[PDB]
Write a structure and sequence with these properties.
The structure is cut from a larger assembly and holds chains A (about 110 residues), B (about 50 residues), C (about 45 residues) and D (about 120 residues).
Chain B lengths: L8 H7 L33
Chain C lengths: L8 H7 L2 H4 L3 H13 L6
Chain D lengths: L7 H18 L1 E5 H20 L2 H7 L7 E4 L3 E4 H12 L8 E8 L6 E7 L1
Helix pairs in contact in D: 1-2, 2-3, 2-4
The chains are: A alpha+beta (about 110), B little secondary structure (about 50), C mainly alpha (about 45), D alpha+beta (about 120).
The structure holds 5 RNA strands.
PDB class: ribosome
Keywords: antibiotics, resistance, Staphylococcus aureus, exit tunnel, RNA, rProteins, erythromycin
Entry title: Erythromycin Resistant Staphylococcus aureus 70S ribosome (delta R88 A89 uL22) in complex with erythromycin.
Chain lengths: ~110, ~50, ~45, ~120
RNA sequence: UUAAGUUAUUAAGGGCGCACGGUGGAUGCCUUGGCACUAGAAGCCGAUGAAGGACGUUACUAACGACGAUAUGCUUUGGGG
RNA sequence: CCGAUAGUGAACCAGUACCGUGAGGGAAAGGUGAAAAGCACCCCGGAAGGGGAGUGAAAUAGAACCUGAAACCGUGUGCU
RNA sequence: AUGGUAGGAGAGCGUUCUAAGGGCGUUGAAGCAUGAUCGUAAGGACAUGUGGAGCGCUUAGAAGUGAGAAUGCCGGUGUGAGUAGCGAAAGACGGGUGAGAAUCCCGUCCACCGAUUGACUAAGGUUUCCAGAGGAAGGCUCGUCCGCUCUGGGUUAGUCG
RNA sequence: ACGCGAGCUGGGUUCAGAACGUCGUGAGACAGUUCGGUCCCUAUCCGUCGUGGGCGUAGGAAAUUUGAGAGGAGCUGUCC
RNA sequence: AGAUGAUGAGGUUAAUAGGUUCGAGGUGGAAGCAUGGUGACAUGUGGAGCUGACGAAUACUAAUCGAUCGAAGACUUAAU
């Protein structure tokens, strides 16, 4: 039994979001939330909102108890990048990269 | 300033093995609230 | 530093612009070329 | 001693403003380096206020800002007056101490360690 | 109680296989815009404003038509339902 | 026969964005319909999701309904 | 008895049509992209995806025919680092507002320019001016401002030009 | 690489100015003198001083010292 | 001790380490009052500030209950 959520086109570059995504992988949902609360990184609040969305999915739509759930998968894919011309330097380009954050949570049973 | 050869995938990822985040502290909240930073009355639910 | 192109409205209407181009024959040829190309602004 | 990322005059000015606002308000929130420096400044001020005579009142005027305080029952004192009047009476038995520091989390725009420094 | 041999137990990395990304056009489509034949013109207007535009006009308003202050049109003859 | 790097520069917003004082130079981007029937309805966070729902002969067929592919690149699993 | 960037006469395939014949196809037929076959070829007959209505085979003819480089061109795409840099100057604290504040607003203190980083008038620019409200982008943040949206708008001369 | 300019200088030579001697009809030349005259780079596949994390680790493991050499440091001299 | 990390001094018996407060060591003559002087000033009251970087006292100071990490001795072979 697995619930998931994705957040699409989040405006943080994927290298910066995979760093904190490596912390919560394979842990329990409660201690995952605690790890996300005690890291000062720009993407801990985004990821925490996706994780709370997936736990809400599991409780509401599949009637899983939210105290047994572990974070089964957590990953970040590249979304579409936006190209900006930096005027501040000399006419060289800057891409705003964006990402897709997927979290899936489960009770380990079948 | 320039690289003669491009670096491969394997050399890039060998360079990134120390480039990662350490696990935080977590002295737990015994009175009330969320788990707070170690040796803190942290600003979100601190009951140290 | 001072640049090329220091704008001036009267000068711009006086060296280019419709009545100056219609006043010579080569100027009328630039307006005929620009019509024939279908330009939105003739001058 | 710490430099706090400032030139010599800027640092002196910042520490005088910090110590004055702590006297005004009795707990303030700042970064952890700054509060670790303002410990010493405000504790020597409270020492001067406990000593109490004219010479130390004139020494204390060298550091405090000239700030007016709207007091309960609509009164007004300066901070030199609150220091030599009220705060010096609280600490007349305590020998040293007088300030406590409590940590908070990081700020949002940097990861600066916030801190509350309070009078005890 | 000595000499000797040996292996895991991380895969940070490697090859294979798996599975969701980004990407953008391989397949199929299009035929709106022209190569050429036939025919017709007549090359085409107006000092009756000729020649391309500018401002406007819809109940609501942002580019072409009408051309136009009679303005998102007016009269009339004939089709048509 | 052009079958759309096309008879055309332009079958889309084209001599237009834009560039140049001016003569002038000059793009990119095309593509339901089976029928919007375009996720009423309804439930958790603004965006985005998870569910049901649908005209759905088929939405990993959700505004990228011309579908729609590849490769580069990915990224998370693992067998050795 | 049987090699040659230069050599002659060779059998063959992708696109198209004739010019045909014969098939696979709206109980599905593709092609195309993922499959064990054919192979020196180039090039085609049976498991996923696709759709959801288009292709093959045979013989012959015609070539916008004919796909690793040209400091090739580009519809173009994407890499090679958490590196360089973030463009002169003094800020601190309290309150407020908020989903969220080194950033926005109010306060107090401090500071800087002061023949000017002040106040007017030209040229030039053309709605940036003023209020509300969300800012999906914009700003070398956030919006919780304007330089996106709505209008609510808003420019008044006998004597100024 | 008459060791060493991605370590530094730029006096010399030699680029545009200018002058003298001399040669040339001339434009100019000589290299004969003379005064003046812009020298770039964020260090990467890599190769080259200091300072850390781990693959090891064979009783569990942890606190207390080999000295093979990979070794490195050469240290000279004058007057009473 | 240090770019960071490492090293070292230390942490709820805990001052410990740092700050503080009282000290002294070392560095440089007060405010107030009085006296004299017409006044500028001088003198007395008497080595004042500092302690910014060099002892004692402290809980002001952290770890909240803290929590986490870390074996089942090879085997063999023959030599007891």
């Amino acid at each position: 039994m697995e619930a998931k959520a994705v957040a699409r086109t989040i405006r943080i570059a994927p290298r910066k979001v995979r760093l904190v995504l490596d912390l919560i992988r394979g842990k329990n949902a409660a201690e995952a939330i605690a790890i996300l609360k005690l890291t000062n990184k720009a993407s801990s609040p985004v990821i925490e909102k996706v994780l709370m969305s997936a736990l809400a999915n599991a409780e509401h739509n599949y009637d899983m108890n939210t105290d047994e759930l572990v974070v089964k998968e957590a990953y970040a894919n590249e979304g579409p990048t936006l190209k900006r011309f930096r005027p501040q330097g000399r006419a060289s380009a800057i891409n705003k990269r964006t990402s897709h954050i997927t979290i899936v949570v489960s009770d380990g049973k079948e | 300033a320039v690289p003669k050869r491009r670096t491969s995938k394997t050399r890039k990822n060998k360079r990134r093995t120390h480039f990662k985040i350490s696990v935080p502290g977590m002295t737990e909240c015994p009175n009330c609230g969320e788990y707070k930073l170690s040796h803190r009355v942290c600003k979100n639910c601190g009951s140290y | 530093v001072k640049r090329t192109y220091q704008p001036n409205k009267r000068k711009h209407s006086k060296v280019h612009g419709f009545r100056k181009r219609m006043s010579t024959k080569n100027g009328r040829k630039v307006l005929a070329r620009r019509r024939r190309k279908g330009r939105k602004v003739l001058s | 001693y710490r430099k706090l990322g400032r030139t010599s005059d800027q640092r002196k000015a910042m520490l005088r403003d910090l110590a004055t606002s702590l006297i005004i308000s009795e707990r303030i929130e700042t970064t952890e380096a700054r509060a670790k420096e303002v410990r010493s400044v405000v504790e020597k001020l409270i020492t001067l206020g406990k000593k109490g005579d004219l010479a130390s009142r004139r020494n204390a005027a060298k550091t405090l800002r000239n700030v007016e305080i709207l007091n309960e029952d609509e009164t007004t004192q300066t901070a030199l007056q609150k220091l030599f009047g009220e705060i010096a009476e609280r600490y007349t038995e305590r020998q040293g101490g007088y300030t406590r520091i409590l940590k908070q989390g990081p700020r949002r725009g940097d990861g600066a360690e916030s801190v509350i420094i309070e009078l005890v």
